[PDB]
Amino acid sequence: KRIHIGPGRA
Amino acid sequence: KRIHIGPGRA
Amino acid sequence: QSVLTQPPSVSAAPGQKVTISCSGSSSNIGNNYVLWYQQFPGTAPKLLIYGNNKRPSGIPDRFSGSKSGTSATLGITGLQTGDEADYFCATWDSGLSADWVFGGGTKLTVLSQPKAAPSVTLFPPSSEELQANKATLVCLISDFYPGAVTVAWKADSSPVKAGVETTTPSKQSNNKYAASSYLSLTPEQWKSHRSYSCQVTHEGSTVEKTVAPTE
Amino acid sequence: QSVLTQPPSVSAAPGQKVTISCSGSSSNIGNNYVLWYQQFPGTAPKLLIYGNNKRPSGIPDRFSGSKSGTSATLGITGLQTGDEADYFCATWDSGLSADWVFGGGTKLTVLSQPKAAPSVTLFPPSSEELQANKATLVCLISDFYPGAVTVAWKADSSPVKAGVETTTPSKQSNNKYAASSYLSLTPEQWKSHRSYSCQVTHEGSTVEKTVAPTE
Amino acid sequence: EVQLVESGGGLVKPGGSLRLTCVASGFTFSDVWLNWVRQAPGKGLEWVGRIKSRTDGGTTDYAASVKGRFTISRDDSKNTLYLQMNSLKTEDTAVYSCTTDGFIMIRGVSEDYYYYYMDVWGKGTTVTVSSASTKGPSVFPLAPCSRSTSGGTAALGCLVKDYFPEPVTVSWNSGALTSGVHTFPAVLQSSGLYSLSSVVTVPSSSLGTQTYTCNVNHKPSNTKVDKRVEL
Amino acid sequence: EVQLVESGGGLVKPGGSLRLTCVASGFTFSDVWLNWVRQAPGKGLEWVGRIKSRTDGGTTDYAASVKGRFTISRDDSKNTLYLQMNSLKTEDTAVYSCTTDGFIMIRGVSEDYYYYYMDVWGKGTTVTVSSASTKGPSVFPLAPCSRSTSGGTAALGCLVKDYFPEPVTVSWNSGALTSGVHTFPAVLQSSGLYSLSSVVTVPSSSLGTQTYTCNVNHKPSNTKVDKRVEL
Numbered sequence: 001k002r003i004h005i006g007p008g009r010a
Numbered sequence: 011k012r013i014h015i016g017p018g019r020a
Numbered sequence: 021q022s023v024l025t026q027p028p029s030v031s032a033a034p035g036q037k038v039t040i041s042c043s044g045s046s047s048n049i050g051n052n053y054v055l056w057y058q059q060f061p062g063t064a065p066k067l068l069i070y071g072n073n074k075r076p077s078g079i080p081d082r083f084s085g086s087k088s089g090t091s092a093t094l095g096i097t098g099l100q101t102g103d104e105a106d107y108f109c110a111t112w113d114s115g116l117s118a119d120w121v122f123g124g125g126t127k128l129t130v131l132s133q134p135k136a137a138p139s140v141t142l143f144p145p146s147s148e149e150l151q152a153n154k155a156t157l158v159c160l161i162s163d164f165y166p167g168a169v170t171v172a173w174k175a176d177s178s179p180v181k182a183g184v185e186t187t188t189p190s191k192q193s194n195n196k197y198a199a200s201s202y203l204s205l206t207p208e209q210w211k212s213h214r215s216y217s218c219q220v221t222h223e224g225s226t227v228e229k230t231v232a233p234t235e
Numbered sequence: 236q237s238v239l240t241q242p243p244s245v246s247a248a249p250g251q252k253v254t255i256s257c258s259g260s261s262s263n264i265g266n267n268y269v270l271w272y273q274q275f276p277g278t279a280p281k282l283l284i285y286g287n288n289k290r291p292s293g294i295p296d297r298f299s300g301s302k303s304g305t306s307a308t309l310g311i312t313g314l315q316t317g318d319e320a321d322y323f324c325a326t327w328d329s330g331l332s333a334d335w336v337f338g339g340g341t342k343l344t345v346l347s348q349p350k351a352a353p354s355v356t357l358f359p360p361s362s363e364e365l366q367a368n369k370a371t372l373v374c375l376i377s378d379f380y381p382g383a384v385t386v387a388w389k390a391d392s393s394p395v396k397a398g399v400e401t402t403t404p405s406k407q408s409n410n411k412y413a414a415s416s417y418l419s420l421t422p423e424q425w426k427s428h429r430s431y432s433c434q435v436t437h438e439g440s441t442v443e444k445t446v447a448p449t450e
Numbered sequence: 451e452v453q454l455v456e457s458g459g460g461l462v463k464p465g466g467s468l469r470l471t472c473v474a475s476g477f478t479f480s481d482v483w484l485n486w487v488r489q490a491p492g493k494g495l496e497w498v499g500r501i502k503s504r505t506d507g508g509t510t511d512y513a514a515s516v517k518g519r520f521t522i523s524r525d526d527s528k529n530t531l532y533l534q535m536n537s538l539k540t541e542d543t544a545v546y547s548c549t550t551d552g553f554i555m556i557r558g559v560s561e562d563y564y565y566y567y568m569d570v571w572g573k574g575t576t577v578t579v580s581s582a583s584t585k586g587p588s589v590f591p592l593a594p595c596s597r598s599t600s601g602g603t604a605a606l607g608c609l610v611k612d613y614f615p616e617p618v619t620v621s622w623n624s625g626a627l628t629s630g631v632h633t634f635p636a637v638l639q640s641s642g643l644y645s646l647s648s649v650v651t652v653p654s655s656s657l658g659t660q661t662y663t664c665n666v667n668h669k670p671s672n673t674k675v676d677k678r679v680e681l
Numbered sequence: 682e683v684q685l686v687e688s689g690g691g692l693v694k695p696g697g698s699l700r701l702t703c704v705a706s707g708f709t710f711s712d713v714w715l716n717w718v719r720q721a722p723g724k725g726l727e728w729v730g731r732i733k734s735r736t737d738g739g740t741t742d743y744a745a746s747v748k749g750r751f752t753i754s755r756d757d758s759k760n761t762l763y764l765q766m767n768s769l770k771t772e773d774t775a776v777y778s779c780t781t782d783g784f785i786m787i788r789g790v791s792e793d794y795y796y797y798y799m800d801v802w803g804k805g806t807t808v809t810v811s812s813a814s815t816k817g818p819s820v821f822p823l824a825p826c827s828r829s830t831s832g833g834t835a836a837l838g839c840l841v842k843d844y845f846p847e848p849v850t851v852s853w854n855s856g857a858l859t860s861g862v863h864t865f866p867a868v869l870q871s872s873g874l875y876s877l878s879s880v881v882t883v884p885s886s887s888l889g890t891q892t893y894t895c896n897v898n899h900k901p902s903n904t905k906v907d908k909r910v911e912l
Contacts, residue, residue: 001560003564006551006564007113007118007500008500013789014794015267015795016327016795017334064573110568117512120568122497143593147816148591149611151814152588158592160634186637187636190634198635270798286796289787323726340725357826362584363822375880400870402865405866413863450827586820675906
């Protein structure tokens with residue numbers, strides 16, 4: 001499991 | 011008797 | 021000329037605290053997370069803060085970050101001369117292209133000498149230039165510290181913005197700063213007014229020089 | 236720009252005859268007596284003829300003068316290289332201020348060498364000049380004999396008179412003649428046409444040089 | 451040991467084309483997202499666009515200011531990022547650099563958080579879009595407006611206008627005068643030409659003793675100008 | 682041993698004043714009529730006015746073009762003629778000289794005829810009415826339009842624009858190049874500024890071997906410009 005914090009991310 | 015031929019003369 | 025807005029400069033003595041603001045809009049800072057970068061002359065930007073208030077390993081807790089609405093702030097406590105550099109914030113736009121957006125950057129000066137007012141010299145157009153159908157007023161600004169100023173030109177008394185070109189502050193050999201500002205006119209205009217003035221603002225105090233076609 | 240009118244120049248070989256006309260109006264030549272002067276470069280005019288047809292002592296009878304109506308003429312027979320100089324007529328106006336009036340002078344060349352066509356070089360505006368918001372075409376005319384020419388500029392094919400400055404013929408070290416002609420344009424104009432031309436007329440024959448912004 | 455080296459910058463006429471390339475080293479190129487950023491003189495950093503990793507679709511995004519004219523692409527085969535610029539406008543003039551999207555990873559109680567940021571930055575390559583070309587400077591004397599004899603020191607100078615490209619070298623009295631000399635950095639004009647000033651302050655009570663000649667040397671156009679300033 | 686020496690000429694702003702003086706020698710000054718004549722560049726001689734001898738009333742006459750602004754007077758006491766010029770216009774720019782009305786006398790059968798003419802002439806004094814002032818030249822390179830390699834000889838040059846006043850000295854390669862050099866006389870502009878050109882012709886088949894630098898020296902404004910011409 002993963003959380004992505006950024007532009008064009010998820 | 012004198013004839014004068016010129017600009018400014020008698 | 022900058023998506024996010026930060027004050028151009030800030031100064032304080034070593035050991036003191038300081039804060040740098042960064043203003044944006046709902047589309048950017050409001051909706052997302054803010055990052056803060058530190059940059060030294062001639063090197064790549066170094067990540068200082070991410071996720072609004074987090075510090076990457078190695079970054080001492082003298083650095084802090086916060087975000088409130090569409091504004092973000094960076095704080096630095098216990099200033100050290102080594103903290104003197106540029107600081108800029110960044111985020112991304114929640115639009116379709118998801119642009120990374122940046123602030124114009126903040127130069128932090130860690131007072132290492134007594135503040136110096138700037139010297140200003142204003143030259144009127146030379147007679148040789150006028151006969152070339154041109155007229156340039158030259159405003160030279162030197163020996164000021166810290167390195168940040170504001171330059172405004174006046175025609176008689178009315179502010180003048182058209183025809184102005186000002187260079188960014190530059191570091192002198194003696195560690196103080198210099199800058200130039202030029203005002204392009206038409207031989208006609210130069211003669212059309214009683215005078216022209218160059219007023220430079222530095223640390224609140226404003227210097228002003230004037231020239232008149234009279235001589 | 237000359238009260239009395241005379242041809243600007245005349246040429247003939249030594250031993251030949253030559254005549255120089257001088258046209259005026261009833262107010263001057265018609266009403267009064269004509270005088271004729273001879274002038275050598277760097278010296279004062281020397282009286283050649285007075286009272287329309289009289290010669291001062293020292294003036295050989297190879298020189299003659301006549302007046303018919305509002306026109307006067309000067310003749311010279313048995314030309315000698317030493318007769319090469321400028322010749323102008325003069326009279327006075329029968330108006331209230333009694334002005335002395337003069338002709339523009341006619342340069343008489345006494346052929347002392349074979350006639351030479353002129354060399355013409357046309358330079359387009361330099362790239363450095365254009366960036367200075369100016370454009371000058373330079374037409375250089377040299378090595379021609381006798382020393383008289385006519386210079387006409389053309390924009391595409393249309394004659395151009397605005398912005399032209401031409402120097403009077405000048406004597407070179409080798410006794411031939413030189414002259415310059417300049418055409419002032421706006422960077423815009425220079426690019427606005429297919430080409431520009433400088434045509435110099437000398438002894439009937441016309442030389443023509445052209446330049447095109449294309450390169 | 452990570453770095454990004456770009457090249458291809460230069461002078462281009464408005465409307466022309468230019469292809470910038472960026473080579474990476476020190477990491478697995480294919481796995482990172484790449485960005486092109488630019489910073490024009492005086493202005494702030496502007497994001498130009500990006501190209502995602504092949505794993506993420508390899509799609510590209512472009513700033514509204516360059517869409518339609520710029521194209522980004524990658525050749526993972528040789529650690530190279532490309533930026534094809536067409537229909538260049540003078541407003542595209544700027545230093546272009548490539549950057550990678552890096553990340554700081556944090557392990558939460560139940561989730562793993564990835565915070566991305568522009569990590570590695572190249573030194574950039576300068577792209578000037580101007581119709582301007584090589585040109586020597588016009589040198590004008592800068593004499594004090596008011597008859598300077600009242601103040602202790604007087605300021606004399608030289609205005610080195612409209613030249614290109616940089617740099618211009620200025621000396622006084624062939625280098626014999628160095629004290630009280632200030633040559634200011636050049637200002638860049640819309641035309642693409644530069645202009646700078648150089649001033650020297652001398653004792654007002656001395657004007658008349660000697661002369662002051664500014665020697666302007668502009669190597670790029672092989673122009674040397676010596677101008678004596680007076681008053 | 683007759684002569685007329687005038688002086689007082691110079692540069693004057695439009696609207697200003699100027700006083701020309703003319704001194705005579707070699708004859709009885711008081712007995713002759715005096716004239717002031719002028720010749721502008723390019724144009725023909727124009728009579729300005731005269732002052733009759735005291736014996737003939739000492740009255741003055743003026744050309745319609747200068748009446749009201751010019752005044753002539755004489756001081757027989759010291760063989761001097763004067764010309765006071767007021768409200769000068771740029772169109773008054775010209776070489777001014779004084780002349781005397783002389784005469785050739787002929788004895789007819791019953792009458793004695795006196796034919797008058799401008800007899801003695803002065804060398805003149807130059808009067809320049811211009812707002813123009815001291816200025817160094819702008820030097821631009823003059824390179825052959827068409828790629829010169831076809832013709833046997835190529836022509837290179839320097840355009841020395843807008844300077845004032847005269848003269849401008851031009852040399853090539855510090856004087857080392859003297860063969861094939863042609864510096865043309867200056868042309869006078871409406872502004873009052875001069876411009877000239879200097880060209881050197883070299884073997885077309887030689888371009889590339891060496892360099893050609895025109896050294897423009899303008900003493901009046903203490904300006905020296907060295908410009909290398911290329912192509």
